[model samples]
Target: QSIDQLIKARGKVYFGVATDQNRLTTGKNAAIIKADFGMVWPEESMQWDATEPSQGNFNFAGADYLVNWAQQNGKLIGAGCLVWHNFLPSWVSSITDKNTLINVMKNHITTLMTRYKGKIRTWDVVGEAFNEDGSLRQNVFLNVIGEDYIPIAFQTARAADPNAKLYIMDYNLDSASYPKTQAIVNRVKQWRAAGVPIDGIGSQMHLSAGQGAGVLQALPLLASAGTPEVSILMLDVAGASPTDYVNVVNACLNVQSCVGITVMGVADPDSAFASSTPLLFDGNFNPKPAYNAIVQNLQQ
Candidate 1:
């Protein structure tokens, strides 16, 4: 059975990967993706830079390629992001008026969400909104629209596609302090209480081998705070053994609220973190020890 089949046989969990249009269409890389992952996250294609590079001129070429492939291959699409601080067009930063900035944000969300309405299973509605010290990162959106940008983004996304699951994604949650993690949890709780249409949290598990325990420690706190689903948006082990990767997987597997684990890439050179073998496949598209580790754990 394929990785997706094996995980589905166990229950509702999904094994996923991040890839772009080029890799997904390439012969060897495409074969590996179809064989292993049940979910496809268009790593950069679906981000702000690619989708809406120039103010009203939307570009869906890359995103459409991946979405079309995922549909034909019986895979679910995890639309990467709708709102993020980085990857902004030059015009976005120049906007000085608060209401104008908010309108631009809402337009971006509504346009993208409506285009891929039922196709995308989940969306990272807001990405990297907080700093390590639990303070809001002052990006163009925050600077112009204030802290209300986070909730506004979620609300706009919800209005666009009511059925799709919405998430707030961030990295460095596996730190010992977990200040950002706690802050995210509290924000989600507040959103839920205020009847905002937020769904879950995406713990971008961009961790080193030593930070594994911190991730495990953070899961229960998120679960206890009424997060319906917690996804390890990106799980990558830098300079670690397969056993280390297995331990990270086990952390999510042991948590009832955790629903999915998406490896950062299909192969080393194809990954954003190319220096690290952050995925289960090597440069030659061969299965690494990490692949076997995940398969064995899932089978047992």
Candidate 2:
């Protein structure tokens, strides 16, 4: 049976993978995605740099292609992100005025969410906004619009697509370094309390070989945040083994609050992710032992 079927059978969680137009169209990727992954998270096609490189001008050739493919294949969709620090356009960074930056951010969120409102189920409305030390990261959005940018992002996304699940995603949130997890939780509560439409927290569980304990610990921490659900947004383990694979999958399986998991790449050592090749499939598109391990656990 397909992994997606087994996974969904196990719980209310959806198994997903990150892919772009190039990877989606490449050898075996599309077929594997359709059979195994029930959800698709565009790695770059939906980024600010790709969707709107300039203010007021937009493009969706690549994102549209993937969205259409996912819909046809009956896969769930995640707008990986709408607000982020990196991949932001040069013009947006140049804005020093709070109003101008706010408008630009809101417009971008409104436009994209409108295009795929009902189709895309979730979005990283704002991501990686906190530094490793639990302080807000210094980006153009933070610099110009200050912390209000986060609320604006969620509010704007909610306005565009009332049904969409909006989240704040970040890396290393699984580790609790510098109590970053607490920072995110506090902000989530802060926003929700103030009537912002923030929905959940996403711990980008980017791990290494033999890494699972942290993820196990992180799920409940994320759930403790003020939201109905939490998710491991991007799960990639460098040089993973069968044990490693089961460890991460089981972690999510054990947590009812973890609604889903999206493997950030298709294969081990795929160039899209780290060189350690953190995925269920190998370079040749063959299911590795890690894949089987995941199946074994999901069969439960």
Candidate 3:
């Protein structure tokens, strides 16, 4: 079986890959994505700037290409980093008026969700909201709308697509005791208490090889907080060791709440971390030790 087939056979939601228009439409990369992954999301095509570069002048050309590709290939598609602070458009960043920004936020969420309501199964409603020290990061949303924007984003997402699973995604929240992870967990509890409709917590496990020590515990820890879904949203294993791949897939295997795993790219050259060779396959599209490692773990 292919990697995603093996993962689904074990009853996980999906084994996915992150791609952009360039990579998705490329023949060589398309071959690997179809053969292994059961789901896909854009690395950049769905970002704020890409979708609405001119404010009110929405452009779905780039994003539509990916969604269409996913559809034709029968892959589940997700929108990663929907409301991120970085990659935000120039018009959005220039907004200082509270009311205008709020409308902009709501409009962006509503429009995107309405456009692909049922097609996109999951979304990173608010991305990178917390810093490593457990403090909320001071992005424009925080500055203009304050901390309320965090929950507001998720609430808007829920209203936009009631059926889609909403996730708040971040990097480095892989330790059970890490302050950022703790901050996220506490807020999720608080949001749930107040009737906020969040569905998942995603740790962008962008690890180097030999760097999954805390991940094994973190996945279940995130799930333990009454949240039904937790995901390793972006996983890119750069360089060495079967143990690294084993730990992450095993980490997800141990938690029924952990639904999906998405590597950042299909091959090393296509990866954002190009110099590091951060993927299951290399430049030649040969499955590396990491791919076999995950397959072995899932087959078990």
Q: Could you say which candidate leads in TM-score?
A: 3
- The 10-residue segment with the lowest total lDDT in model 3: 236-245
Candidate 3 Cα RMSD (Å): 1.2
Among the numbered candidates, top lDDT falls to 3
What TM-score, over all chains together, does every model reach? Answer: 0.95, 0.96, 0.97
Q: Model 3 lDDT vs. the true structure? A: 0.85
**Alpha-carbon deviation at 209 in model 3, angstroms:** 3.4
Please, what are the lDDT tens digits per residue for candidate 1 over residues 59-176? 9999989999999999898986887877777888899999999999999999999999988888999999899888889899889899899889988898888888898888887754
lDDT of 2 at 295: 83
Order of quality (lDDT): 3, 2, 1
**After superposition on all CA atoms, what RMSD does each candidate show versus the true structure?**
1.5, 1.4, 1.2
lDDT of each: 0.82, 0.83, 0.85
After superposition of all CA atoms, the RMSD between model 2 and the true structure is 1.4
Q: On residues 65-152, what C-alpha lDDT tens digit does candidate 3 reach at each position?
A: 9999899999999896777788998789788988899999999989988999899989988999888898989889888998889778
> How many clashes in candidate 3?
0
lDDT tens digits, residue span 72-180, model 2 = 9899999858888778889888989988888888999999999998888888888899988789999999888888888888888988999889988988776644478
- Clashes (backbone N, CA, C under 3 Å), per candidate, total 0, 2, 0
